[PDB]
């Protein structure tokens, strides 16, 4: 498949997406014979009239957490955290009795028994957090039933990086970003970098994220479309990676924890077996299963990534929607960042198109 080809697939397939999902701008890699290609489309600020470009800025939402698995897993590698310690372990001030078996590792894979999806808006402080989980009465048995859940794995976030002595911001840039040239990726983005940051949409509306508790670990990440392309590459080919942990934290993170029905969950990416038709994939994208709270069957001990995987995670904030997915048997992947947040499902199935192209 040719350069010009893919250029014609991709086009062919995000402008009419773009149309009726009425998205302001894009930005699109593909990952293809051992490196990116990039598309990028319409604009990244409106009223400003400024284009897409391969610098631009967007929010990653959720995708931050595939940063916040591989984080944990290089934390894990470095011997700073096992997955089968107690989160109290790590926290000694959470007494309450509840948390009793509850593992690091369901924390980090949303099996900790019913953690909500939300960290309370009233949660200001440390003070607050501790009250948080400390009142939260686990409505199932860990390891029972997997929630997906920003208080869940934000949490683990946090935890993962205690033992380093280490803020959270600085262990991702000392140990995951900059061992990766990854230059333009942002938990806070830097005054002189203000002007690549895209405005999101909605309903017409400019809009871009506000700070909440564990935002950083379960949502918080800004990047451009070369940079996630790097990131997915990297993810995609760890035999690449150099830094010993690293590469060890970029493997558990792809690792399977549990199945979920025809998925299975790893520290922040998830998984299917490939091949994988479309339709199975876009199914458990839509809302009503993915934020279901669902049994599971334990993969103990857990399985290492398996190469023949669709792997993937759709993340969105209020104006922005991204989605990514690679098939490591295949080195083939894709990056979709976009300015405004349409149906997951839609994402899906461009993402599974333009890869289709490519087998
Ligand atoms: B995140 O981006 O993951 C999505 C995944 C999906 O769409 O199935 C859903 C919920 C949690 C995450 N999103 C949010 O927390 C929403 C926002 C965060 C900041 C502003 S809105
Ligand atoms: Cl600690």
Redesign the pocket.
């Given at each position: 498949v040719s350069e010009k080809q893919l250029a014609e697939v991709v086009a062919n397939t995000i402008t009419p997406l773009m149309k009726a999902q009425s998205v302001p701008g894009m930005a699109v890699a593909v990952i293809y014979q051992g490196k990116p290609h990039y598309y990028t489309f319409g604009k990244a600020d409106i009223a400003a009239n400024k284009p897409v470009t391969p610098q631009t800025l967007f929010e990653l939402?959720?995708i931050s957490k595939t940063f916040t698995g591989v984080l944990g897993g290089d934390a894990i590698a470095r011997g700073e955290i096992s997955l089968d310690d107690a989160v109290t372990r790590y926290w000694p001030q959470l007494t309450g009795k509840q948390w009793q078996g509850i593992r690091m590792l369901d924390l980090a894979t949303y099996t900790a028994g019913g953690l909500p999806?939300?960290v309370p808006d009233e949660v200001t402080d440390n003070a607050s957090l501790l009250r948080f989980y400390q009142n939260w009465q686990p409505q199932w048995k860990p390891g029972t039933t997997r929630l997906?859940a920003?208080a869940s794995i934000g949490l683990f976030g946090a935890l993962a990086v205690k033992p380093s002595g280490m803020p959270y911001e600085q262990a991702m840039t000392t140990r995951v970003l900059k061992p990766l040239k990854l230059d333009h990726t942002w938990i806070n983005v830097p005054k002189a970098e203000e002007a690549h940051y895209a405005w999101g949409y909605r309903d017409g509306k400019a809009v871009r994220?506000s700070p909440?508790m564990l935002?950083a670990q379960?949502?918080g990440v800004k990047t451009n479309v070369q940079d996630m392309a790097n990131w997915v590459m990297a993810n995609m080919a760890p035999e690449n990676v150099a830094d010993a942990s690293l590469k060890q934290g970029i493997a558990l993170a792809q690792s399977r924890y549990w199945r979920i029905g025809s998925m299975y969950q790893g520290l922040g990416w998830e998984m299917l077996n490939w091949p994988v038709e479309a339709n199975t994939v876009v199914e458990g994208?839509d809302?009503k299963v993915?934020?279901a709270p669902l049994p599971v069957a334990e993969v103990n001990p857990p399985a290492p990534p398996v190469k023949a995987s669709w792997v993937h995670k759709?993340?969105?904030?209020?104006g922005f929607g991204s989605y990514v997915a690679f098939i490591p048997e295949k080195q083939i992947g894709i990056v979709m960042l976009a300015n405004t947040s349409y149906p997951?499902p839609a994402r899906v199935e461009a993402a599974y198109h333009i890869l289709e192209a490519l087998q």
């Open positions: 939402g959720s999806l939300q997906y920003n994220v909440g935002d379960a949502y994208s809302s993915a934020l759709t993340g969105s904030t209020g997951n």
